[model samples]
Target: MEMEKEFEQIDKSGSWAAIYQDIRHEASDFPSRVAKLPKNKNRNRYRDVSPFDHSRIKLHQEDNDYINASLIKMEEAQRSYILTQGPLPNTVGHFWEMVWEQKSRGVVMLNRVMEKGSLKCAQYWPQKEEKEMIFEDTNLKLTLISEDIKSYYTVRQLELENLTTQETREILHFHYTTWPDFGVPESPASFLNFLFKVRESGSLSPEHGPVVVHCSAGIGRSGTFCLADTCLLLMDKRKDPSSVDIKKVLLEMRKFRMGLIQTADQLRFSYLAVIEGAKFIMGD
Candidate 1:
């Protein structure tokens, strides 16, 4: 297939630099409805960050509801994901609010709380010293139920409770500790391993609300993860691994959130992961 050969050529020549340029050129022309709401301006972690208006996820709370989050739904793959930025210190309450509102079963974190001497994400969940943490702003309480620690990732069982309604729900926290900001993981093998672990939990299934996915900026590593996972699922559904056009799929995904797959290297890494995942889907 032409796409297969293109992947081979990219791998051999290391010319993803040019291909990535083309992708950025294509992405630049699209309309990004960043920060349409005056209130969102204050909520965003970065001034330039904003969700495309068409695909932005809106909170249904009664008052002062604004968060930088987008619900990206891959209808074909039967997956819905809430692609959002790392929750700012102030937005932690809103973050849990969205999780409760969406009835999300899992939160897939792709970056660490601190990376390279900077705060990439807030320590949103409860600490081991304390069993539960309360977000006074949203009147929500998060309790730690259990934790399974691994070398590369950590899984936690958190119960989110709405104080007003006294309603509580279990939320899974899957944190990938190794991926760097604006860079790919060490290898596709480890990434695919993590991806499959999330899949095995039924969090990505359409049966539940969208799984929340985020990195520091919510577009770089988050985009790569979604793109690779979506393409692999499409391959499985079609029964032809090569039928998936990774670049085209990414462009389609960017429609929901602007500037996905942030760098040329990230784009190249997406292809590498997709190709590696295809091997598994193909029973290779």
Candidate 2:
């Protein structure tokens, strides 16, 4: 597109921008070694987004096992997430491979395949009419068995098959169809509703592997989703909705991933989402 447009929507004089500036003070940085290597250059969707070396996931059974994905954990909330940029065309196979290897039962997609007149991500999965998508690089086949469309979201059931081993597993794909990139949703209702829908699947629980969460760059909306959910989970566990600090939780997660909750609006949106979610979790 024309450069990029993340925080531009946030007014500089607003309160949202104020707290967002404070978040900037606590920004984290780390060396992304594997991402620095020449051979892996094209694997990246953006030059600035890199998976930190200490926490990046390395592919198994491959000659050059590198993927731009980060494995992040929220110790207090007891959750894990595989945060990564949207897959490039060549990396679609690797994306599904990561899902299969991680045994991730839930996939949270926060952005559409296209955004604002330009392609924001890979058309990674087979559409409804196609029924199935096969990735030769990973020898994995994904067949669509279900689809439920709502005004703001869609839930699809994808059966992942390992061609080499002849095994199969089902993964729930939770796609938020209308969330603005680098921005917040209309309100916490739609977001928390989507959150709990995935939660009800039992895929986001401790027993399952990390939920595969991604948007375009994997930092903005992806980060906000994780931060809001993690904070609310802690509030639920403690039975004190006010105990969790949204900013601090986000800062901690930022250590594992970069540029999370991109704009001030996004940061403020995280607060509202958690505030609303805490209330929902409270009415037990």
Candidate 3:
């Protein structure tokens, strides 16, 4: 299909490293507000994970204003997503604070509770039915309404209640349980299927608030989801699928979220998924 010519072009150009470098150079100029608020350290999962000042989502509360989350918006695609790191034990409150303030309707998680015998993310959500999780720090409560289990993923319907205002909203949680750490999925079809399931919920629409997407550090698997989904949307809009440049789409996406398509494997998988999705969209 159209990917034949695109893959040839990628081979001729020697692929992503050079483009990655240019994007890195440009991203370096982005301000890191973490330096000013050293106390925010407790909220960060990693020393290197800090939100860029321009895109960082600031907590409205006076006491705690730190969470490693950034808002990514694609105007052409009418898509907006909040790309953030998996919440630490202490930051779980702030994580929910972001959802409440941002009015997010869904959360797309790309990591598991624990991976490779390490704590990849805190068990931020409720584990049992009819059980409600209360975060004293943010004074918010999250209750698990229902869950649908599938082979590779699980979807949950949750109620996020603002303890202060007593306001509540339904939030859909899309968790991909099998994607490896720092690795690509088994195939693009499965990945795209998960994506389509999320889209079908109407949560990804710009009419709603931005969807929150996260992984361990929020830059690897998180970035891949945003990149591949955005690329697929671009292809759907264009008359010629190959007319959309994957690298340019990625660079634009990275401008919002920090390091998207983290590894070469992730980058390569993105192209494959995009091509496969394009063919499906075109009914080829």
Candidate 4:
């Protein structure tokens, strides 16, 4: 109908002003490459760009509130955690390199976490008497204390004490990349256990906090875990969901981030794990 109206109307541009463009303009078609300077494409990659610098002196006092806010935000959004694009590096050596680089930067906040960073760093792990000081020699600050790992709630205190973006990234990356190697059946249980700890630790974050979690290219296990976290939160509400309603959440997450819960098997496994975790925690 609009096209028919346009065709019916006669052209009246005979007295119109000069074409609106500049007085002189040349039209040319050519491929363009605007590479004059080196590019760093990681400016807006993570939800919060704040680095873990000593300048965050406030952390020495009110870290609990900060961590709580972060966790809540993530839980509300249902994202597994925030993630920076980096290797879920497996080796002790690589982990050390990352840690050393962070140490040298002086502003440990800029250290690469599950996400990338904007600085070059060197290593330093001065001799110390504390047991935690040993791993201080590497890119990692804490090691998994698995002996008492079954109580996911207990670790909440430790995470709260050292809840930095760097730490979140490191733990998540390790979970995605290496935790799977603990064998098939065991990995799911263990990962879910860790997930519960983070979720239950209201002390760790708030409803809108950003979480950092990654594995390799940020698509495989990382993506799955993030989507799973969101889905499981809804599932835990105790209401049965129809397929159409359940898919609505997935559809929205897909628009914001592609490849969420990348595979059918991942979705299934995640749901089962969450349910199992709930049963165990709820004494069902």
TM of each candidate vs. truth:
0.93, 0.92, 0.92, 0.41
Q: What is the TM-score (0 to 1) of candidate 2?
A: 0.92
Off by over 4 Å in 1: 28-38
Score each candidate by Cα lDDT.
Answer: 0.83, 0.83, 0.83, 0.33
Predicted candidate 2: what Cα RMSD to the true structure? Answer: 5.6
Model 2: per-residue Cα lDDT at residue 168: 97
lDDT of 3 by residue, 1-284 (tens): 46657676866888757655666666535777762487877777777666788888889977767778988888887788899989888889889989999988889998899898898999999989767899997899999999999998999999999999998899999999989764577688877899999999988986788999999989888888888788788778877776777777777877766677677677778777887787778766
Instruction: Write down the lDDT that model 1 would get.
Output: 0.83
Clashing pairs in 1: none
RMSD of each: 1.9, 5.6, 2.2, 17.1
Candidate with the greatest TM-score versus the true structure: 1
* Collision count for each candidate, in order: 0, 0, 0, 26
Worst 10 residues of 2 by lDDT: 1-10
Tens-digit lDDT track of model 1 for 84-195 = 9999888998898899888899999999888888998888888773767999987998999989999889998888889999988878898888775545666888888999
lDDT of 4 by residue, 1-284 (tens): 22112222312432111211111122122221111112312222333222222111111222121110011123334343343333222222233333233221111011222233432122222122233422432324543322222322122111111223454322221222233322223446656656655555441244423444434334345545555566555545544422213234544543333344434444445445554554553345
Ranking by TM-score: 1, 3, 2, 4
